[PDB]
């Protein structure tokens, strides 16, 4: 029975660079005796070949003891050759998410670990894979060898293997559309939606198809049945979840102890609803000092204690059914926290997740909800190839007022309101025109940049005025303080005239929460008002009210 | 044919741009399109020894119910040599922007008949992604001139002038310009006869093509002699409120950065006190004087403004609400080369991003007709929202560059 030849992939070195010439380290006699035995068997299998002294390249080789078994293991240090090898199209960059796996009746895993060292290497590239087995007592030249197949640990071997395996599996998948095959390292995941009797028959057909290229896979019942242990998940036949993470308790948490926490909670948040990690991730700023056992925050242990009520009972996700709509629900959790669940029928989720607000100076809930929708949208297109329908905690009228008056263009895909508090709302809305019968407050601020001394205040049309002296302030700070005084001292409706482009830029961004306490105070004032018209005029232009309060403030 | 000496710029590697996620409908369409293209020899499968990549997606122009393949060659186009050995950039037809009826043709399919440099094909690599990474991405590289690449019109420029020589000699009043995959054709006659004599130009490519049939079916018809110019205009009122005079003084202060003789001393004099915003202020004839000179100053063009082909064109867009969008094209601040407004957009009365998106396309088309160059956009939209949705509404075969404005500009009201 002749074997079909696996077509070789032409591989070149990086332009200008040469191959490796790193010398060989001295090994003990038992290590050398073990390598000679290994390399003799590999040579009999065609994997490697003895080369003459005309090959001037070398790659260091080692021998490491296998666990339990007394038999040694061979290892080549291709690190230097991988630095001089061309770039490849890495195809294993993204792995499937379990939530996107379609419902299949029977799934089978095939181990093709032998095939990795059975894929030929480019004939013109083997000369750069040369390595040397040092001789006993260094009294004869080392046994020179070069690889004929894809060497374990070479930069291009993972990509060339999958590409070679894909070309082999193409005719079978084409002539078997009821068969879904997924390849990953030395594993073949073959599932189908038919009866088990027709499954193992088509499974056997795949074995003979692979035998044509000399690739044999175990026939006896594999020790890896649902659920699988694949990339941190548990792949049961009907459901999926993360590998159980018993996140531990600790008396004194350090930098590496909380980074072990931070990583492990974000992994569990894809199936466990309502996971929060920010207060724990808040303990990571500055340099990455491994000798710093930072104390804990009280607002990090009570939120930790909340992560346990979710991580106590096992929660599973279902698989994707393309015949039912895809839904995504969002909840506001506070302090820039959003959580989401993607599902198709009530009670059972496909996956969950969280979104953290971007580090910014000013923000509001509507912006944050929008960004989370875009995130869920991009992740859904990856996993399922379609945008889900959204259930959002925001009234249709609220969103309509927001997007029609927002200065930016903004949009969210098809969505419906879900009455699940806390509801995202507009806390204030400025007027488009001046308010008749409302007092007009002309405000201004000014600070001395040298002594940090400043003043802020207002003058109104009813003769009301105020000027407050300030210490440890700036021009920008007094401009905001002026507006705050006007809001603090006016009735329910008020017109405010300012010259501060700085303040307008903040307010026209329409925040509801700020890192600046002065902005937050302004916001609390705006919320209490009925109507607020904020007008801008240019400074130092002799504009009355503004000019007459510019002199009082810069006095 | 069979000869196209083309390489990369010295000191630059090929594009390695990541493919962004695609919906199921677009992946299937790209699979169908590319399967046929592979059979016609337009593209070939490639192995992992090709690391380069350029993103691809599908485009469904409302003119047809079939999908089109769009390759975003922006990164590649920056990295290929400038084709001056052919032409040092054919002088942009200034008669294009002085025409009443300019129509665009998609002559991109004509590029597919000319082969591409065998050593250059590796740089046109692209990936059809799979859903959920369930299968490796289907990878292809172009064998002929790709649609959207800068080198495709530059190489085809020798052949394109030969198919058009009889038509150009038959009508020297008609000026033809080519940008990327588009042919810009202008005429000054009736619309009913316009579409017929454009079909005369259309049938030159069919006779050359044969040497469903793939040729031209649609023509997006523009009228660049009926386009928007937006001068700075001041209100005309019989009674002015304090608020009215504040906004006017602010507008005039802003326009004084563009025009020199703009004075606001006498109008700010009207705001002599601390009055209520809605209080009507009578205009003193000395301030009415000052408003008159400013009005006449705004009638004249901007002083010392010019176009420089070495510098980049910048387009800023403002959202004005209720479908209105204002824009300015410039190179130096306050030296605008063109301003305009867009009142209504095709549908999208509930979709802001669709409106902005096709506003960007219109502004780019206008920029191509006037200067033969696309501008760099400053977009009033969060990056994550734009990047998520602009491909769903795109139509043009080219793609410009853009940045994102995250601070609300104060000058929105002055262009309104
Ligand atoms: C043929 C791939 O198998 C499926 O599409 C599938 C369907 N149901 N199901 C249940 C458990 C495990 C897998 C899996 C897998 C591969 C590792 C990704 C699975």
From Swiss-Prot, chain B:
The record marks 389, 402 as: Essential for RT p66/p51 heterodimerization. Residues 215-223 are annotated as: RT 'primer grip'. Changing residue 219 to A: Complete loss of RNA-dependent DNA polymerase activity. Complete loss of RNA 5'-end and 3'-end cleavages. It comes from the Viruses. Changing residue 393 to L: No effect on RT p66/p51 heterodimerization. Changing residue 163 to V: 70% loss of DNA-directed DNA polymerase activity. 64% loss of RNA-directed DNA polymerase activity. Changing residue 61 to R: 10-fold decreased sensitivity to ddATP and ddCTP inhibitors. Mg(2+) 1 binds at residues 106, 181-182. Changing residue 51 to G: 64% loss of polymerase activity. 57% loss of RNase H activity. Changing residue 298 to S: 31% loss of polymerase activity. No loss of RNase H activity. Changing residue 180 to V: 58% loss of polymerase activity. No loss of RNase H activity. Changing residue 185 to M: 27% increase of DNA-directed DNA polymerase activity. 10% loss of RNA-directed DNA polymerase activity. Changing residue 223 to A: Complete loss of RNA-dependent DNA polymerase activity. Complete loss of RNA 5'-end and 3'-end cleavages. Changing residue 394 to L: Decreased RT p66/p51 heterodimerization. Changing residue 152 to A: 74% loss of polymerase activity. 56% loss of RNase H activity. Changing residue 245 to T: 96% loss of polymerase activity. 45% loss of RNase H activity. The lineage of its organism: Viruses, Riboviria, Pararnavirae, Artverviricota, Revtraviricetes. Changing residue 402 to L: Almost complete loss of RT p66/p51 heterodimerization. It comes from Human immunodeficiency virus type 1 group M subtype B (isolate BH10) (HIV-1). This is p51 RT. Changing residue 61 to Q: Strong decrease in RT binding affinity for all dNTP substrates and in catalytic efficiency. 100-fold decreased sensitivity to ddNTP inhibitors. Changing residue 153 to G: 34% loss of polymerase activity. No loss of RNase H activity. Changing residue 180 to I: 54% loss of polymerase activity according to PubMed:9533880; increases polymerase activity according to PubMed:9657675. No loss of RNase H activity.
């Amino acid at each position: 029975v002749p074997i079909s030849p696996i077509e070789t992939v032409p591989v070149k070195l990086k332009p200008g660079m040469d191959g490796p010439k790193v010398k060989q380290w001295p090994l003990t006699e038992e290590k050398i005796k073990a390598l000679v035995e290994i390399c003799t068997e590999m040579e009999k299998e065609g994997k490697i070949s003895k080369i003459g002294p005309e090959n001037p390249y070398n790659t260091p080789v080692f021998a490491i003891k296998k666990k339990d078994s007394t038999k040694w293991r061979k290892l080549v240090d291709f690190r230097e050759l991988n630095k001089r090898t061309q770039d490849f199209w890495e195809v294993q960059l993204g792995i499937p998410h379990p939530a996107g796996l379609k419902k299949k009746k029977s799934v089978t895993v095939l181990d093709v670990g032998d095939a990795y060292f059975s894929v030929p290497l480019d004939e013109d590239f083997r000369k750069y894979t040369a390595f040397t087995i040092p001789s006993i007592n260094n009294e004869t030249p080392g046994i020179r060898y070069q690889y004929n197949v894809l060497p374990q640990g070479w930069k291009g071997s993972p990509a060339i293997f999958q590409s070679s395996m894909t070309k082999i599996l193409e005719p079978f998948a084409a002539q078997n559309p009821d068969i879904v095959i997924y390849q990953y390292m030395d594993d073949l995941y073959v599932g189908s939606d038919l009866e088990i009797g027709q499954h193992r028959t088509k499974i056997e057909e795949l074995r003979q198809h692979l035998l044509r290229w000399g690739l044999t896979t175990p026939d006896k019942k594999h020790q890896k049945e649902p659920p699988f242990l694949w990339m941190g998940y548990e792949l049961h036949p009907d459901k999926w979840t993360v590998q159980p993470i018993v996140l531990p308790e600790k008396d004194s948490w350090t930098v590496n102890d909380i980074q072990k926490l931070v990583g492990k909670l974000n992994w569990a948040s894809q199936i466990y609803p309502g996971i929060k990690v920010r207060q724990l991730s808040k303990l990571l700023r500055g340099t990455k000092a491994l000798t710093e056992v930072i104390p804990l925050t009280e607002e990090a242990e009570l939120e930790l204690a909340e992560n346990r009520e979710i991580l106590k009972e096992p929660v599973h996700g279902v698989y994707y059914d393309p015949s039912k709509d895809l839904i995504a629900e969002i909840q506001k959790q506070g302090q820039g926290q959003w959580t989401y669940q993607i599902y198709q029928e009530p009670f059972k989720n496909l996956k969950t997740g969280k979104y953290a607000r971007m580090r910014g100076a000013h923000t509001n809930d509507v912006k944050q909800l929008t960004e989370a929708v875009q995130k869920i949208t991009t992740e859904s297109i990856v996993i399922w190839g379609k945008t889900p329908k959204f259930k959002l905690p925001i009234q249709k009228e609220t969103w309509e007022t927001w997007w029609t008056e927002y200065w930016q263009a903004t949009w969210i895909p098809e969505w419906e309101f879900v009455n699940t508090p806390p509801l995202v709302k507009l806390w204030y809305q400025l007027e488009k025109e001046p308010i008749v019968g409302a007092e007009t407050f002309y405000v201004d601020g000014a600070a001395n940049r040298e002594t940090k001394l400043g003043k802020a205040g207002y003058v109104t049309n009813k003769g009301r005025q105020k000027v407050v002296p300030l210490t440890n302030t700036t021009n920008q700070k007094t401009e905001l303080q002026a507006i705050y005084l006007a809001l603090q001292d006016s009735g329910l409706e008020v017109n405010i005239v300012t010259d501060s482009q700085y303040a307008l830029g903040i307010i026209q961004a329409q925040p509801d929460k700020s890192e600046s306490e002065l902005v937050n105070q302004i916001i609390e004032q705006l919320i209490k008002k009925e109507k607020v018209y904020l007008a801008w005029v240019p400074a130092h232009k002799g504009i009355g009210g503004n000019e007459q309060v510019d002199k009082l403030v810069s006095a | 044919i069979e000869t196209v000496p083309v390489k990369l710029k010295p000191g630059m590697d090929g594009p390695k741009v990541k493919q962004w996620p695609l919906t199921e409908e677009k992946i299937k369409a790209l699979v169908e399109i590319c399967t046929e293209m592979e059979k016609e020899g337009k593209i070939s499968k490639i192995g992992p020894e090709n690391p380069y990549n350029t993103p691809v997606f599908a485009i469904k122009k409302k003119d047809s119910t079939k999908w089109r393949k769009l390759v975003d060659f922006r990164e590649l186009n920056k990295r290929t040599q400038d084709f001056w050995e052919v032409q040092l950039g054919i002088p942009h037809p200034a008669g294009l922007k002085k025409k009443k009826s300019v129509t665009v043709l998609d002559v991109g399919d004509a590029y597919f008949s000319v082969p591409l440099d065998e050593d250059f094909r590796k740089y046109t690599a692209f990936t059809i992604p799979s859903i959920n990474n369930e299968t490796p991405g289907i990878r292809y590289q172009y064998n002929v001139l790709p649609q959207g690449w800068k080198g495709s019109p530059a190489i085809f420029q020798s052949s394109m002038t030969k198919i058009l020589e009889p038509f150009k000699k038959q009508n020297p009043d008609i000026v033809i310009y080519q940008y990327m995959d588009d042919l810009y054709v202008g005429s000054d006659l009736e619309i009913g006869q316009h579409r017929t004599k454009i079909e005369e130009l259309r049938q030159h490519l069919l006779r050359w093509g044969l040497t469903e049939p793939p040729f031209l079916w649609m023509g997006y018809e523009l009228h660049p002699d009926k386009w928007t110019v937006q001068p700075i205009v001041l209100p005309e009122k019989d009674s002015w409120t304090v608020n009215d005079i504040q906004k006017l003084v602010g507008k005039l202060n802003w326009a004084s950065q563009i025009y020199p003789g703009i004075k606001v001393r006498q109008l700010s004099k009207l705001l002599r006190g601390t009055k209520a915003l809605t209080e009507v202020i009578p205009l003193t004839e000395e301030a009415e004087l000052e408003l008159a000179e400013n009005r006449e100053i705004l009638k004249e063009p901007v002083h010392g403004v010019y176009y420089d082909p070495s510098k980049d064109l910048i387009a800023e867009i403002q959202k004005q609400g209720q479908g209105q969008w204002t824009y300015q094209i410039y190179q130096e601040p306050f030296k605008n080369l063109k301003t305009g407004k867009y009142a209504r957009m095709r549908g999208a009365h509930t979709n802001d991003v669709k409106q902005l998106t096709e506003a960007v396309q219109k502004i780019t088309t206008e920029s191509i007709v006037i200067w033969g160059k696309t501008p760099k956009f400053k977009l009033p939209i969060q990056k994550e929202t734009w990047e998520t949705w602009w491909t769903e509404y795109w139509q043009a075969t080219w793609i410009p560059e853009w940045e994102f404005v995250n601070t609300p500009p104060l000058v929105k009201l002055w262009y309104q």
